[PDB]
Amino acid sequence: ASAARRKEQELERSQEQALREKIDSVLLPILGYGNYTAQVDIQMDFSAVEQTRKRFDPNTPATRSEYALEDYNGSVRKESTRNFELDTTISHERKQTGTVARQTVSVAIKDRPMSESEINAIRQVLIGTVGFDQGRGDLLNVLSVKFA
Amino acid sequence: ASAARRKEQELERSQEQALREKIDSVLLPILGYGNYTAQVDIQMDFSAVEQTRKRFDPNTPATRSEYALEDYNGSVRKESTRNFELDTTISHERKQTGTVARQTVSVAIKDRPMSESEINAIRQVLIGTVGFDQGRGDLLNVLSVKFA
């Protein structure tokens, strides 16, 4: 199984490399060659979830058989027996093993600095270039630093 | 199964490449060569959902057999027994494995900037060029940036 773990590491590294390639394909025309640096971290879960759900519909029952005895005298006896049929959904789901659980991307732009408007524009391009998903916990940093 | 995961990555990359090709086929005449850059992120779910639904119709029962005893004297006894037949739908669905769960497209247009009207027109063309589906969670960014 350790060979499987090794190949999982290979998958994660391949994903990171592909994302880096896309980042380059976007930023190389916009910024130029050597005016930026970017690295990508991709964390992938490899669990084996397998779920079975059996759901009913309480608010729409359908009476199948029914008995109702109601006699008076004073005495009032109200017996009743009822059998129901209910909407039944049975869903069996099997999640894919390797899923990107969190994605971190950081891009540093060489100074000569960059204005806030262009930094936010680059961030907007990257959002969509990488597939930024904040609800997944992903993080995207864009900074303007001084290259040596 | 890790080979299957590798081929799933290949499928996702192929989808992204096809969408990029369509984006180019639309924008190359409109904008020109080298006046734009665009990248596409496609996230695909590969679950194995398999659902079985059994639904009834509570509001239209059909009486199959019926017994009704109603005697008086004062004393009033009202016995009743009833059997019903109901509309029964049984649907077994099996979803396709790989489905595009979210799609992100970002396009950056070289300045010399672009007016808001033409930006929105390009966005309208892309909506339909790519098959934008906001209800799916898809995202489409169109920006006017300064190429270096």
Binding site: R64, S65, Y67, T81, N83 | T81
Partner: peptide, 12 residues
């Protein structure tokens, strides 16, 4: 009565 119900108990 119809014990048809997979959980029919009323029976009677």
């Amino acid at each position: 009565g119809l014990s048809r119900t997979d959980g029919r108990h009323i029976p009677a």
